Design an enzyme around this catalytic site. Sequence first.
Site, PDB file in Angstrom:
ATOM      1  N   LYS A  64       0.816  -1.168   0.000  1.00 33.00           N
ATOM      2  CA  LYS A  64       0.000   0.000   0.000  1.00 33.00           C
ATOM      3  C   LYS A  64       0.869   1.243   0.000  1.00 33.00           C
ATOM      4  CE  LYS A  64      -2.438  -3.368   1.200  1.00 33.00           C
ATOM      5  NZ  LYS A  64      -3.399  -4.373   1.699  1.00 33.00           N
ATOM      6  N   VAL A  95     -25.290   8.937  15.115  1.00 28.10           N
ATOM      7  CA  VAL A  95     -26.344   9.014  16.045  1.00 28.10           C
ATOM      8  C   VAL A  95     -25.864   8.460  17.324  1.00 28.10           C
ATOM      9  CG1 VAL A  95     -28.521   8.095  16.455  1.00 28.10           C
ATOM     10  CG2 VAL A  95     -27.634   8.509  14.095  1.00 28.10           C
ATOM     11  N   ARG A 141     -21.149  22.244  18.693  1.00 31.35           N
ATOM     12  CA  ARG A 141     -20.289  22.617  19.806  1.00 31.35           C
ATOM     13  C   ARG A 141     -20.989  23.581  20.766  1.00 31.35           C
ATOM     14  NH1 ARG A 141     -15.970  19.702  20.592  1.00 31.35           N
ATOM     15  NH2 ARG A 141     -15.130  21.579  21.649  1.00 31.35           N
TER      16      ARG A 141
HETATM   17 NA    NA Z   1     -22.970   6.909  17.533  1.00 34.50          NA
END
Ligand code: NA
Length: 327
Positions: A64, A95, A141
């Site tokens: 790689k 989520v 934030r």
């Molecule tokens: Na999550």
Amino acid sequence: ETLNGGITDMLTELANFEKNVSQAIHKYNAYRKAASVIAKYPHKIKSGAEAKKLPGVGTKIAEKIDEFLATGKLRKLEKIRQDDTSSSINFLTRVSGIGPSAARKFVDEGIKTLEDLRKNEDKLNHHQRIGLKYFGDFEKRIPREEMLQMQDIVLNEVKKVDSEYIATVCGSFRRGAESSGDMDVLLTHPSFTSESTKQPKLLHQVVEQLQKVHFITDTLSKGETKFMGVCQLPSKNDEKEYPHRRIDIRLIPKDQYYCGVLYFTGSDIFNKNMRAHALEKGFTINEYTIRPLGVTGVAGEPLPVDSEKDIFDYIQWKYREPKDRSE
DNA sequence: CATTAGA
DNA sequence: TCTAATGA
Ligand code: NA
Ligand code: NA
Ligand SMILES: [Zn+2]
Ligand SMILES: [Zn+2]
């Protein structure tokens, strides 16, 4: 630190993928030490062959690395970056309450998007329900501006409930930060310590208070020492409501506060750095205590700590204000 | 590296 | 009971 940046970031992207998308903990684990050692390597890597000399660097990764050094890209990466299935997991996972696990599961079922998310809210448990529910508010934030008000209110109730309570909002916030992600609140009381067999209500009392006056809107989890919730500033005289904010409350045995507090304030680097020192200075530091070191290799025997000062003193350091706990 | 949920 | 998720 930049001489090996891409090599490392490629490797992370690589690493991170195994872990989540597939379940190649090894591979995944491979990519990380590899990305860890190359990071330190004090020299610009020119070939994989060169890299290969490293520990954790095998044939696999060298391959790689060549391609990446050769052409400014990677096919395996370009293919992953593209791919929907993988893409999807990457996303669902945002989520709160959705780990790779469920992400892969939902995905298979055909729940790739957030909308899919809603239509199948039934498939979600409460944590995740709220995750979805405040998806936006969650990624945002916190203005310290706000931090100061939130904090204001917390302290007031803690105090009104019982005046013996000791709270500390630790975090980035404590370390002067302009914004933070969530409010981490440290908590212990006098009647609670190492031995004195708990006092659940001790956490529960306030958790109520806080919900009582509407600062807490939800509960991610609540146990005898840790409560995970959702708080929110009173959306004043309208036209402007407050984003829902992740909040965590924790109960410490009075005898181990500051270690805890010291700990949580961080930063990660101040930590280690503070932690690396206590070692030379004849000690041991960890999230709850500070013990002297015994020559036999090790030792124990928890030192009595009254404040973030005592710990320093112990390791006989300079008391570093939180603001300057950055490294 | 520990605590909570959940099934 | 295990296994998941959150906690820089
Ligand atoms: Na999550
Ligand atoms: Na090697
Ligand atoms: Zn060199
Ligand atoms: Zn935080």
